[PDB]
Design a protein around this ligand. Structure first.
Ligand SMILES: *[C@@H]1O[C@H](CO)[C@@H](O[C@H]2O[C@H](CO)[C@@H](O[C@@H]3O[C@H](CO[C@H]4O[C@H](CO[C@H]5O[C@H](CO)[C@@H](O)[C@H](O)[C@@H]5O)[C@@H](O)[C@H](O)[C@@H]4O)[C@@H](O)[C@H](O)[C@@H]3O)[C@H](O)[C@H]2NC(C)=O)[C@H](O)[C@H]1NC(C)=O
Ligand SMILES: *[C@@H]1O[C@H](CO)[C@@H](O[C@@H]2O[C@H](CO)[C@@H](O[C@@H]3O[C@H](CO[C@@H]4O[C@H](CO)[C@@H](O)[C@H](O)[C@@H]4O)[C@@H](O)[C@H](O)[C@@H]3O)[C@H](O)[C@H]2NC(C)=O)[C@H](O)[C@H]1NC(C)=O
Ligand SMILES: *[C@@H]1O[C@H](CO)[C@@H](O[C@@H]2O[C@H](CO)[C@@H](O[C@@H]3O[C@H](CO[C@@H]4O[C@H](CO)[C@@H](O)[C@H](O)[C@@H]4O)[C@@H](O)[C@H](O)[C@@H]3O)[C@H](O)[C@H]2NC(C)=O)[C@H](O)[C@H]1NC(C)=O
Ligand SMILES: *[C@@H]1O[C@H](CO)[C@@H](O[C@H]2O[C@H](CO)[C@@H](O[C@@H]3O[C@H](CO[C@@H]4O[C@H](CO)[C@@H](O)[C@H](O)[C@@H]4O)[C@@H](O)[C@H](O)[C@@H]3O)[C@H](O)[C@H]2NC(C)=O)[C@H](O)[C@H]1NC(C)=O
Ligand code: HEM
Ligand code: HEM
Ligand SMILES: *[C@@H]1O[C@H](CO)[C@@H](O[C@H]2O[C@H](CO)[C@@H](O)[C@H](O)[C@H]2NC(C)=O)[C@H](O)[C@H]1NC(C)=O
Ligand SMILES: CCCCCCCCO[C@@H]1O[C@H](CO)[C@@H](O)[C@H](O)[C@H]1O
Ligand SMILES: CCCCCCCCO[C@@H]1O[C@H](CO)[C@@H](O)[C@H](O)[C@H]1O
Ligand SMILES: CCCCCCCCO[C@@H]1O[C@H](CO)[C@@H](O)[C@H](O)[C@H]1O
Ligand SMILES: CCCCCCCCO[C@@H]1O[C@H](CO)[C@@H](O)[C@H](O)[C@H]1O
Ligand SMILES: O=C(O)Cc1ccccc1Nc1c(Cl)cccc1Cl
Ligand SMILES: O=C(O)Cc1ccccc1Nc1c(Cl)cccc1Cl
Lengths: 553, 553
């Protein structure tokens, strides 16, 4: 019989619905296109497409000509373009969410059950001739061999954008609040039910964990004093599930919102920094409202820290990553005259996309010392030994690896990428070319056009058989890179829409929540508006070291 | 020190926030007002208030002049006005939701924890001089004595709008999918985590329950055959928790989505019809899609039945109790050019408001038979004995009681109204007049202005002391009802914003969901678009009885 939806016949966000025994129909509703396969353009769509500049042209404009951008940033155009960046990107993501691992169709279970990761494109049907649809071979390339030949680091390729480990660990810390895949429920299921910037990696994904982390006085979190410095509490003081190597003494075990943070000094670094910020905010709130109870001081402080995150993420984190000459601005009031949905659901493709393990180097240089992976991983002493000040300085000076290009994942953590590709076939993600079309890009006609070179393309031509069979995750990390950039063109075009919908879709960005009273007055509101990475560290430390998302020079 | 927020100083949705020892500050952001109390209006605010007609004047316009409304309904002005009713009403509701029983302030916990009912106006602070704020007596009037003197039915007062029991049972059935107060967690908590029209009273509030009702063949729900007619299955066949009187084994019980439905035949009547509807819809969808599995057939039928519910509710259910000459219309497309959040959280005020126990008659009539409360309540054979047709005919012919005016609750179920007022004091709901202001109405200056008479006004003035001490629920029922109507001025103005935000805020009404493909093509899309109370009943029965929300002339 053969399922007609395996060919992906519907174009431009049309929906393949199986009718009768062998036929199909495309629902081209509000797609801007008509006809059986949604290809005949409406008057406005045809006009827009011929007048639309290429995605690369827009990226070129945003990365060149300082004289124009010095002017733009000092004018109203900054706010006009930022609004355009917000609206155009985030509208590519369905809201309310559509599909999940169980349903390749809209249902109430896909809407209400927040334990699911959502998906933009439906899974490849289980009745297709090839696991990627119709094109390609019956068996996809070996996940170990594909990572070994194309992803394994032979030499450290530094990021030309000057990105450091301070960014890398921020990226990991920030993302692991909404990427919490369930080990028992399996792939496609999440434990971070907040689905965005909830800070559940500081406070906990569940209520009882939070209560266990809370000192229940002045709204503050629990903490311990080691060498005159404030650190996260021990397991004895806060009895919560923490993933530590079995046998390790409880005095060496620290307790934070996310279970996996104790395994890396870079992760527990930010956990300390943010904990110091929470209690600091409580002190400012208490001086402003001495009549407030413990519960209000905590909840008000959480929203301030949620606002501080989004501020730093957009104006510094994205600023370093995108390399835009356009000065980015966190201002929810930009969307106040627009049709925007203040909700978010984490997609599995955003999970796959955010596996930036190439960022990690060969070693971890802290001052005169150079620490290996076996010296750095699962180390429960390093954070206390050096302190926040010394480590933040050390991570801001060490270069990070280039994400795109290829052959840049250190062999110690390569197994992750292997499992990511394995998870992609379990989830049955559509080919890379299908996602290219979903995010408004032209699909690649050959492997030579993808990598931009002759060598690595020829081997991939033999393995996959066809370009329309190329997988999602390998495509993003093997795509040609414009010199000076951190990754390929697709990463920006696929990632930004998710990322902005997660940031600005946070309820605090809504007209209902974006008020002074929400953050306990003007003091709390200004802390959100003026927050910086530098102010996140140095205000919570004795001295102020070099702190940035980029290395010196 | 005296709490300043006990005076409710901040007007027009301004937020009272405690500062220092004895000081307060109003957050007048986006209220349309400025200053210390949000009392001085902006240029556009002053313009709106002076040109705005009174609530009772627009209600007058909608309920008078047949000839003008015949013209309007046949033109685009029908759609123009419906869009206005949709937008202006539902915007009075905070979205995303703000407060709950735990927090009288915006928090992440209030946003994320869906086990809470939300609220529109914050509670009366615990450290206020009087239980209702600053007004009235130290001890609030007795709950049982208030119900016996002002709410207890002497002579039966029927609805002047000719509303029947078919409406009354629909009301109780329809509401108990989003009104499910958790007796274990307490007042202000809810098991109905859908917070809207999810049909959890048919399928279940949780997944494990839903799976027990489902056949897992053809997307259908389980059913038993009695007298050659389709009925809900036994609890012996579908093992789900149902609240039946002790001594009644699962062999006689019937298994449906909502636990309390076995207590009333009228509730079980509507459980049957929708179950017959679900399986009838499954049959239609199976013919269009013979390659669909069980899971897709079930989920798609649910979306259709949700679509059918909101359709009938707006164009007939709301049409009956509103008494508008304007032909109401369910078209989600009306909101596609508007700022509208497709989400809903059930408020405690909507819960309190929807206690329409006055609708219930002195005795239930089924043709020549007249069954009392003892015979009707907990009856297990009445539905099977008579059938669907006979009971639909009976409930459609018998008039329901007038909700407003007072003194129209039968002595059998008066204890509910006692528990509503008692729950209101635990929830610490603000005074009636404070809620009047919040839904754009002038507060009553006296009890005589509220009632319309003299006797009950003077006795309430003795019990409460002040009009600003009057409670939410008693105020709604003892209010004066305009020209021949179900209830008073406030019931529309307070309940309509809650309802329309609940109905149109359903995700199926969003541009993403409101497609033909979501309902499995045009056949499923038309069943929503052409849904009727009559078509819900007569298409699922052998013969077609009298079916309406009003009695025959
Ligand atoms: C949405 O929100 C509601 C309401 O908040 C919530 O309902 C429940 O919430 C919690 C449980 O999740 C219940 O909490 C109650 O309060 C006491 C607190 O007293 C003490 O608790 C600690 C003692 O217990 C612990 O002891 C040791 C450590 O001390 C520990 O090792 C044990 O494992 C044990 O847990 C103590 O540390 C602390 O200092 C306090 O003195 C709890 O003990 C107990 O759990 C109580 O039941 C609420 O009562 C629940 N219901 C209500 C109505 O409030 C929902 O869970 C939430 N929903 C979601 C989906 O998140
Ligand atoms: C977790 O991380 C902590 C980081 O604090 C580790 O603790 C530290 O471990 C080092 C050993 O590596 C301790 O000794 C230090 O190391 C030097 C090594 O010699 C140096 O090597 C270079 C290049 O080979 C040579 O040019 C020079 O000889 C140079 O000195 C040693 O000489 C010194 O004694 C120096 O202190 C260090 O003391 C210790 N830190 C603290 C605060 O005690 C820890 O090992 C690690 N844990 C695990 C389980 O891996
Ligand atoms: C659950 O509901 C069922 C209905 O399905 C109840 O069973 C029914 O009970 C009624 C009495 O309440 C039975 O009526 C019988 O028929 C006549 C009725 O009298 C007639 O009507 C009026 C008023 O009564 C009189 O003025 C007329 O003159 C006329 O006679 C009577 O003669 C019989 O004695 C008897 O009452 C009905 O038949 C019966 N149905 C079935 C199928 O058994 C059931 O009681 C109820 N459960 C509980 C606990 O009450
Ligand atoms: C969000 O959705 C998740 C996935 O649907 C839910 O995860 C869990 O719920 C599933 C369904 O309850 C679990 O599936 C299991 O199904 C087997 C099959 O047994 C069958 O059901 C009956 C068993 O009593 C039998 O009568 C029948 O004949 C048949 O054999 C059953 O054995 C298990 O008991 C269980 O129900 C599943 O284990 C689980 N996880 C996953 C990954 O599927 C979430 O509950 C849901 N979340 C929310 C908040 O609703
Ligand atoms: C040396 C440090 C690192 C180690 C040891 C490491 C290893 C791991 C491990 C063990 C997992 C969980 C198992 C799995 O999904 O394969 C994981 C997942 C993941 N990693 Fe890393 N990685 C590192 C660096 C990073 C960084 C810097 C980022 C951020 C750019 C990152 C992004 C992710 C993401 C998004 C997941 C999936 C999380 C989930 O779905 O639950 N990793 N990695
Ligand atoms: C004679 C028929 C009815 C009976 C026997 C009945 C019974 C009850 C009972 C026992 C409660 C719980 C009271 C408590 O303990 O707090 C309740 C609450 C309630 N009633 Fe009724 N009722 C009837 C009719 C109606 C009708 C017609 C409506 C109109 C919609 C209605 C609306 C409600 C609502 C919304 C609740 C609160 C639900 C919740 O949050 O749990 N009732 N009723
Ligand atoms: C409709 O879209 C389909 C995409 O599959 C196009 O291809 C179909 O029609 C062709 C011409 O009749 C056939 O050669 C193909 O076999 C057939 N595809 C499949 C999978 O069977 C088709 O061109 C489109 N129709 C129009 C009018 O453009
Ligand atoms: C479709 C009409 C819009 C005008 C598009 C002009 C073509 C853009 O051409 C662009 O030129 C840049 C350098 O100038 C390159 O960096 C880009 O790769 C290339 O796409
Ligand atoms: C001159 C700079 C203008 C920047 C404003 C445009 C930002 C919108 O970004 C656009 O988003 C679309 C959806 O993701 C993509 O299809 C486009 O390629 C991308 O440029
Ligand atoms: C100076 C401009 C004011 C004219 C706009 C008046 C709109 C208010 O509408 C008024 O509502 C009253 C009910 O309170 C009715 O009595 C009036 O007839 C009606 O015009
Ligand atoms: C001082 C001005 C504030 C009073 C506001 C009262 C306006 C009249 O009341 C209005 O009735 C309409 C009935 O269709 C609804 O659309 C509106 O939601 C309702 O506010
Ligand atoms: O957006 C983020 O938070 C990180 C991220 C990851 C992948 C792709 C884009 C982005 N951000 C981002 C955004 Cl939100 C806009 C423009 C350019 C970029 Cl790189
Ligand atoms: O829609 C409902 O649930 C019925 C309901 C209950 C309370 C208050 C209003 C309404 N309906 C209603 C609506 Cl939603 C709009 C205009 C007029 C009326 Cl009577």
């Amino acid at each position: 019989p053969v399922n007609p939806c395996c060919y992906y016949p519907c174009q431009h966000q049309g929906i393949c619905v199986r009718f009768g025994l062998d036929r199909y129909q495309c629902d081209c509703t509000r797609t801007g296109y008509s006809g059986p396969n949604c290809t005949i353009p409406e008057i406005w769509t045809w006009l827009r497409t011929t007048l639309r500049p290429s995605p690369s042209f827009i990226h070129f404009l945003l990365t060149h000509g300082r004289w124009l951008w010095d002017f733009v940033n000092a004018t109203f155009i900054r706010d006009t373009l930022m609004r355009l960046v917000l609206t155009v990107r985030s509208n590519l993501i369905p809201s309310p969410p559509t599909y999940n691992i169980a349903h390749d169709y809209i249902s109430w279970e896909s809407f209400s059950n927040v334990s699911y990761y959502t998906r933009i494109l439906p899974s490849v049907p289980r009745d297709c001739p090839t696991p990627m649809g119709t094109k390609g071979k019956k068996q996809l390339p070996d996940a170990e061999f594909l990572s070994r030949r194309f992803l394994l680091r032979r030499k450290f390729i530094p990021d030309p954008q000057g990105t450091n480990l301070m960014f890398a660990f921020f990226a990991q810390h920030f993302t692991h609040q909404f990427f919490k895949t369930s080990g028992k429920m399996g792939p496609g299921f999440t434990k971070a039910l907040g689905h965005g910037v909830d800070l559940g990696h500081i406070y906990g994904d569940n209520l009882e964990r939070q209560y266990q982390l809370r000192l229940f006085k002045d709204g503050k979190l629990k903490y311990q004093m080691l060498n005159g410095e404030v650190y996260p509490p021990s397991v004895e003081e806060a009895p919560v599930l923490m993933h530590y190597p079995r046998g390790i003494p409880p005095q060496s075990q620290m307790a934070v919102g996310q279970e996996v943070f104790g395994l890396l000094p870079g992760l527990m670094l930010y956990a300390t920094i943010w904990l110091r910020e929470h209690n600091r905010v409580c002190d400012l709130l208490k001086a402003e409202h001495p009549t407030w109870g413990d519960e209000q001081l905590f909840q008000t402080a959480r929203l301030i820290l949620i606002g501080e995150t989004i501020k730093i993420v957009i104006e510094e984190y994205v600023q370093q990553l995108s390399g835009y000459f356009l000065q980015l601005k966190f201002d929810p009031e930009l969307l106040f005259g627009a049709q925007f949905q203040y909700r978010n659901r984490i997609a599995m493709e955003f999970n796959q996309l955010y596996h930036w393990h190439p960022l990690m180097p060969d070693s971890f240089r802290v001052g005169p010392q150079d620490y290996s992976y076996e010296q750095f991983l699962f180390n429960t002493s390093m954070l206390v030994d050096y302190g926040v000040e010394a480590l933040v300085d050390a991570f801001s000076r060490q270069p990070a690896g280039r994400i795109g290009g290829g052959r840049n994942i250190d062999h110690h953590i390569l197994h992750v990428a292997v499992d990511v590709i394995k998870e992609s076939r379990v989830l049955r993600l559509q080919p890379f070319n299908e996602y290219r079309k979903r995010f408004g890009m032209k699909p690649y006609t050959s492997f030579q056009e993808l990598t931009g070179e002759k060598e690595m393309a020829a081997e991939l031509e033999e393995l996959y058989g066809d370009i329309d069979a190329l997988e999602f995750y390998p495509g993003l990390l093997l795509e040609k890179c414009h010199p000076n950039s951190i990754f390929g063109e697709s990463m920006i075009e696929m990632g930004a829409p998710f990322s902005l919908k997660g940031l600005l879709g946070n309820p605090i960005c809504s007209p209902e929540y974006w008020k002074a009273s929400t953050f306990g007055g003007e003091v709390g509101f200004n802390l959100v508006k003026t927050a910086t990475l530098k102010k996140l560290v140095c205000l919570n430390t004795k001295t102020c070291p070099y702190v940035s998302f980029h290395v010196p020079d």
